[PDB]
Design a protein around this ligand. Structure first.
Ligand SMILES: Nc1ncnc2c1ncn2[C@@H]1O[C@H](COP(=O)(O)OP(=O)(O)OP(=O)(O)O)[C@@H](O)[C@H]1O
Lengths: 155, 834, 86, 86, 86, 86
RNA sequence: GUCCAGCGUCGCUGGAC
């Protein structure tokens, strides 16, 4: 976005914004980190304009008109108990000009991190697991070209 | 447990054991000092006003309660400009010894120690000339070679570094203490005085019997020591070798020498840092390891002391009329980062003036506190400073300067504290307090900032800035002098001039519709396709004519363009709702600018009974005014509110002028299809976009409310239809019914605007209505809900049925506005069928 | 106005304010420290009030002590305006 | 006065070598921070008094001012029939 | 400091309210005495133009500001504002 | 402000410049002939009142004196604005 | 599955049935 030798004051200022938005050094949960890195990846779509990315694939939230094959919308509830446990953790949403959904391996890595803790108890696992399977929204970075329109629409 | 009362002098020499802030740090350092002596320079650093003098005075008092004797604290600022430090330290050491020397009881000891001590003192006096000298006078070489056999001087010469070593050893024996502690103070006032202290420390105070504590900030010593290394270079060399390769290498040798010199004087493992208030109280969520509470009014017993963070918030939420939330936490978190000398400076003025006022206009108390405290930052910012000129005129000009220096126009007028320069993080919170006071408990003033204060920023950023830093300032010096940000006459006159600026920029395919305005033809065109005709003012009868004759404009170009702007409508509301007295003033505001004022082009332009005509209309305003005068007291605007509503009112208004520009088919007149569009449909949305914007933000950011009634969902904008606008109104109406909350009190600003008689004719014009089975369901529901909110039926059922399903005169609806034609548009194309 | 409301008090309360004559830095002769001007104006008030006593013993005791402090100040006044140490 | 006297407190040679427009950035910042704290220490905010013109006392329409000023024009009228200042 | 003791001196002449030397008041009573001898209400001091110099004006301007303030003196300057303003 | 500060020798001709020389300093030719004190400088907000007093005194009780000031003094500020832009 | 709506410049998102 801004090379180093072009400006040594713009490059450093970007680092000041990046640490605040990405919440590095003041983290509170590994899963929240994985939710944030999903948004920053999509800030630079590839020239081919496809929904596949580094470690994520963007499912379609709204059903399209004509599917040449037996394709359909995701319909999160279709799966079964254990499958829903893993899939719900993977699912993530980024608030942009229009809402888009993402499914990344980072959330699965984040999912294991939150679960892994000492003093396991039946109530502790139940509450922690239910927190793992949750739907969270992440705003686009302030340096995005659409960091203002996603603020008007809201979550 | 710390309790900081606000009704004490609070000077460093006026604090007790309880008022101390860094109690934990003080006990750590004092214990650390005694460890070093039993089994050598310390340092306590921090920003200005962080409690340097107060902290060091706490340490010296604690030690007086291994035995260590402490000299009185000294500072280089309150000393003669030429007196050496060694003289100052020796003089104070003499006083302590003399007092202890008189306290003896044995005659033999006192009569013997005094001469032994006096012998050392008289010896140092001889060698003092070696410090205040200018040139080596060789007559002292003879007197520097008489080496005395006594006193055990290991090395010859004057060696004044060792005369102090023997002197302090004798003084410790008299006082019977293992060590002597010397306290210095900050050099913040006198920058230069610190060099003499630093040089003396490394040369003389190197004994094992001495311990030194220095106070200041390494950010200033570094810039002093590095400033002294350059004098070590010859002046001729510095001026000759100037190529950047050598200047860079030379610029690094100085820096490395500075770090080594400082690192050898103050050891890193000895420094102590003073944490500011933010790190002590912690964050809102993460409770800190210690708590601080303050007193607010006299007589408060210590039990009911409120937290400092809560104390700041109560002066911010109420001071800026800002609802408790994330934004409120931002202002208080910024205020904590200020130096303690300034944090406790605002509090001692706001609360003290609050008690005597109570014995209100709370923002008047807060402004008078922030303005005095942050006063230096205003002068640097170039902002206004005069005391008896506060009002509308200053703040509108004032708001343009802050955004100008912040290099931002989009989010600039939110008065956020999220800038990067310190000189602009002090002028944002003060400005947020200035606007909160001035536009409070009134409606005429609230609409002036929304139109002028937060409006002039975006207009410049979109229509004039697309024309070289001297020209950019040249352009600004013309935009201000034209729009008259200062020396303003009325919000209506501002809109007329704003109409010329927005119309100067070209539009694609030369279609006479712009942002928040529609241009109507002035002459007549032969062979008009359809029923279009020249616009005429002699069509509407009553309130339809009054509410539309006040929304015209006239420029003075080569040929006159007759505009029609929603902005001119907004100026009429703020002009009318200003003077409560009389009734003739309402007539004047309707016809004050229409046919009296000519507005020349900008200088950078590249290119029936007459009395009954308004008697029903005039009365309607009068009964509306009484509703305003009874509820406008309860409104609490804020800097965020007047800015957020303008963002929604801008982008929404931008889409309307764009989407409705390709739908000018020849079937526009009387058109009621969704894909159809004409002048009536365009303006029906402009005045509705304004009403929609106020509704959304009022439920979000307003002081009088307690929470949001929108609920979970997506906030959209009615650009092409009105399908979701009443969906918002219907949903909100359900919430207040369940909570048993009256509609008027919770949303006072929305109530006084939707009930405005002027906007009523523009809600349902003739051409703006849409005829469809689904559209009629929404349009009917829209009519029903507004009936309940206003309390008066807008249009009768007999008149309403005529509009929806295909003569009759009207008094509350514009009739022949759709039939008018936009100049610069040709209607050859027809409506596509789909 | 506040001067005439403090130098013309009716002796109502024990705490009292005595106001020196107004000092004008602009009209003051340059190269003269403010501390010297303040002491000179302070001297007139004390000296005139010292002359106003009625008890002979009290007047002689205060005059000896007050004149001692002035002699102490003048010795240290050299330290205020110097270009070198000695 | 204070800001100017802070600049005179720097090493002159340093002010001629380090002027690379980025070292100068913290030169101006550091002077203002020193100057701002100096003014608060001398004159506290809670000890500042401003004179009020007669408008902020009384005169604005629709507001009962905290004080009332009465002016008599004709010679020798009573203190009860005089006209208001506004 | 050798003249410090001279400033702190009590005088039987007019019992000077302001302490120190204060050359303004010393010259003030001199004009009062001169009026009694000359038997006139006031004495006028008339200055000529400085139109050929820019250092004679500054001493004239400063003296008028500080010394010639009594009611027994009327001063009639001469020149043009352009030089004085510059 | 550079207006006609003459105590006497008044007339309508001397007033026309005063109107024109005031609007030029205010650099607002659209509403210069209103004489309403809306400027941002205290030196000009106190001279519009004086000007508004002279137009009333001169034009009170005449018709030729009314048309002349309107036709000449009032119109020149508007006609000139049509040729400044070019 | 279909109608309505909105953001970006066809894709995209909300709602209803
Ligand atoms: N622990 C404390 N409790 C209460 N007030 C405090 C405390 N520490 C500092 N203050 C406030 O801050 C100011 C004290 O600042 P201090 O004089 O210690 O700073 P400094 O500028 O480093 O010192 P110096 O006066 O020597 O320049 C006062 O206004 C005082 O009320």
């Amino acid at each position: 976005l801004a090379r180093a030798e072009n400006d040594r004051e713009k490059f450093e200022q970007l680092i000041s914004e990046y640490v605040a938005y990405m919440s590095v050094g003041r983290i509170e949960s590994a899963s929240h980190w994985a939710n944030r890195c999903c948004a920053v990846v999509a800030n630079s779509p590839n020239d081919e304009k496809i929904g596949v990315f580094l470690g994520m694939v963007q499912l379609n939230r709204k059903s399209r008109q004509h599917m040449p094959g037996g394709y359909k919308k995701f319909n999160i509830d279709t799966e079964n108990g254990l499958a829903k446990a893993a899939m719900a953790s993977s699912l993530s949403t980024v608030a942009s000009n229009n809402l888009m959904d993402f499914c990344s391996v980072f959330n699965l890595i984040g999912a294991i991190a939150d679960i892994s803790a000492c003093r396991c108890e039946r109530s502790a696992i139940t509450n922690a697991f239910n927190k793992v399977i949750a739907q969270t929204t992440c705003i686009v970075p302030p340096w995005s070209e659409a960091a203002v329109r996603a603020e008007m629409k809201g979550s | 447990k710390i309790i900081i009362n606000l009704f004490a002098p609070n000077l460093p020499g006026s604090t007790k054991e309880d008022d101390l802030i860094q109690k934990s740090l003080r006990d750590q350092l004092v214990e650390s000092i005694r460890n070093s002596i039993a089994y050598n320079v310390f340092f306590v650093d921090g920003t200005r006003g962080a409690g340097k003098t107060t902290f060091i005075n706490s340490v010296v008092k604690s030690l007086n309660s291994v035995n260590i004797k402490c000299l009185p604290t000294i500072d280089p600022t309150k000393l003669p400009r030429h007196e050496p430090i060694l003289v100052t330290v020796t003089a104070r050491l003499n006083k302590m010894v003399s007092d202890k020397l008189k306290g003896y009881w044995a005659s033999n000891d006192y009569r013997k120690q005094k001469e032994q001590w006096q012998n050392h003192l008289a010896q140092l006096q001889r060698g003092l000339h070696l410090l205040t000298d200018k040139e080596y006078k060789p007559e002292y070489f003879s007197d520097a070679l008489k080496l005395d056999a006594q006193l055990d001087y290991s090395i010859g010469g004057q060696d004044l570094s060792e005369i102090f070593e023997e002197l302090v050893k004798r003084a410790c024996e008299i006082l019977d203490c293992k060590a002597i502690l010397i306290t210095f103070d900050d050099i913040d006032t006198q920058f230069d005085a610190g060099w003499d202290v630093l040089e003396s420390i490394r040369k003389f105070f190197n004994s094992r019997k001495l311990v030194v504590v220095a106070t200041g900030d390494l950010r200033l010593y570094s810039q002093l020591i590095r400033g002294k290394q350059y004098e070590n270079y010859s002046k001729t060399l510095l001026e000759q070798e100037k190529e950047s390769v050598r200047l860079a290498e030379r610029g690094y040798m100085v820096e490395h020498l500075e770090q080594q010199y400082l690192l050898k004087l103050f050891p890193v493992q000895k420094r102590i840092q003073l944490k500011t208030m933010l790190q002590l109280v912690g964050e809102k969520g993460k409770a800190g390891k210690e708590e601080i509470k303050v007193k607010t009014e006299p007589g408060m017993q210590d039990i009911d002391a409120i937290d400092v963070r809560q104390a700041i918030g109560d002066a911010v939420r109420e001071g800026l009329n800002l609802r408790e939330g994330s934004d409120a936490d931002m202002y208080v978190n910024e205020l904590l980062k200020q130096p303690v000398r300034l944090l406790m400076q605002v509090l001692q003025d706001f609360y003290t003036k609050k008690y005597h006022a109570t014995s209100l206009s709370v923002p008047n108390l807060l402004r008078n506190a922030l303005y005095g405290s942050m006063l230096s930052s205003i002068y640097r910012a170039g902002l206004n400073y005069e005391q008896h000129r506060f009002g509308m005129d200053s703040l509108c000009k004032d708001i343009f300067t802050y955004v100008k220096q912040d290099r931002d126009f989009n989010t600039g007028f939110y008065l956020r504290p999220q800038s990067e320069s310190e000189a602009l993080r002090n002028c944002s919170i003060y400005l947020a307090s200035q606007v909160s006071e001035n536009c409070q408990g009134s409606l005429s003033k609230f609409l002036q900032m929304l139109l002028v204060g937060c409006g002039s920023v975006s207009i410049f950023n979109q229509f004039v800035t697309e024309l070289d830093r001297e020209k950019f300032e040249q352009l600004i010096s013309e935009y201000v002098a034209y729009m008259s940000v200062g020396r303003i006459e009325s919000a209506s006159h501002w809109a007329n001039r704003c109409c010329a600026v927005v119309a100067n920029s070209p539009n694609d395919e030369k279609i006479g519709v712009f942002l928040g305005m529609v241009q109507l033809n002035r002459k007549s065109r032969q062979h008009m396709p359809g029923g279009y005709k020249k616009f005429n003012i002699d069509t509407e009868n009553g309130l339809a004519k009054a509410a539309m004759a006040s929304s015209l404009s006239t420029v003075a170009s080569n040929n006159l363009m007759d505009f029609c702007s929603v902005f001119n409508l907004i100026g009429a509301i703020a002009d009318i709702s200003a003077c409560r007295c009389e009734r003739s003033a309402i007539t004047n505001a309707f016809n004050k600018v229409i046919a009296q004022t000519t507005c020349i082009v900008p200088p950078w332009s590249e290119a029936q009974d007459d009395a009954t005509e308004f008697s029903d209309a005039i009365t309607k305003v009068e009964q509306w005014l009484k509703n305003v005068n009874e509820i406008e007291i309860g409104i609490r605007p804020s800097a965020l509110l007047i800015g957020k509503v303008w963002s929604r009112f801008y982008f929404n208004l931008n889409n309307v002028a764009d989407q409705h520009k390709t739908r000018l088919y020849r079937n526009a007149e009387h058109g009621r299809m969704a894909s159809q569009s004409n002048a009536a449909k365009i303006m029906r949305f402009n005045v509705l976009a304004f009403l929609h914007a106020v509704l959304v933000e009022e439920s979000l950011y307003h002081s009088v409310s307690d929470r949001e009634y929108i609920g979970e969902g997506l906030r959209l904008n009615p650009v092409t239809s009105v399908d979701e606008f009443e969906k918002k109104i219907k949903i909100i109406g359900e919430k207040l019914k369940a909570d048993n909350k009256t509609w008027k009190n919770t949303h006072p600003l929305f109530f006084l605007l939707i009930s405005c008689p002027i906007l009523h004719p523009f809600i349902f014009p003739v051409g703006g209505i849409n005829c469809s089975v689904k559209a009629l369901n929404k349009e009917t529901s829209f009519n029903k809900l507004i009936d309940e909110i206003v309390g008066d039926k807008l249009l009768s059922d007999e008149e309403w049925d005529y509009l929806t399903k295909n003569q009759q005169i009207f008094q509350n609806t514009i009739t022949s506005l759709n039939s008018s034609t936009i100049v610069g548009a040709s209607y050859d194309k027809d409506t596509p069928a789909r | 106005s506040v001067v005439k409301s403090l130098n013309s008090d009716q002796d109502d309360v024990k705490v009292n304010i005595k106001c020196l004559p107004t000092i004008d830095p602009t009209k003051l002769p340059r190269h003269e420290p403010i501390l010297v001007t303040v002491t000179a104006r302070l001297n007139k008030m004390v000296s005139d009030k010292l002359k106003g006593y009625w008890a002979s013993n009290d007047y002689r005791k205060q005059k000896e002590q007050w004149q001692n402090h002035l002699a102490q100040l003048q010795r240290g006044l050299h330290l205020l305006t110097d270009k070198e140490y000695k």
